[PDB]
C-alpha cells in the first residue's frame, strides 16, 4: 500500500551548452505537478549563490 512507481531520469538531453532538458518517468497520476512545482519553487529562490 506504500509501494508507488519509483521514477528515474531516463535521459538528460542537454541541448547545446548552459542548457539541459531532464525528463523523469514514471510518476503517479498527479506527482509530476508536485515534483515540478517543488523543484521549480526551490531552484527559483532557495538555491543560494553570489552576484
Amino acid at each position: 500500500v506504500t509501494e508507488f512507481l519509483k521514477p528515474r531520469l531516463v535521459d538528460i538531453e542537454q541541448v547545446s551548452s548552459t542548457h539541459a532538458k531532464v525528463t523523469l518517468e514514471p510518476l503517479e497520476r498527479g506527482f509530476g505537478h508536485t515534483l515540478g512545482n517543488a523543484l521549480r519553487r526551490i531552484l527559483l529562490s532557495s538555491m543560494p549563490g553570489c552576484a
Binding site: 517543488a38 523543484l39 526551490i42 532557495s46 538555491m47
Partner: peptide
C-alpha cells in the same frame, strides 16, 4: 533535491 530532502528529515 538535497535542500528539499534536508527539509524533511525531522518527519520521516
Amino acid at each position: 533535491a538535497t535542500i528539499l530532502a534536508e527539509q524533511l528529515e525531522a518527519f520521516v
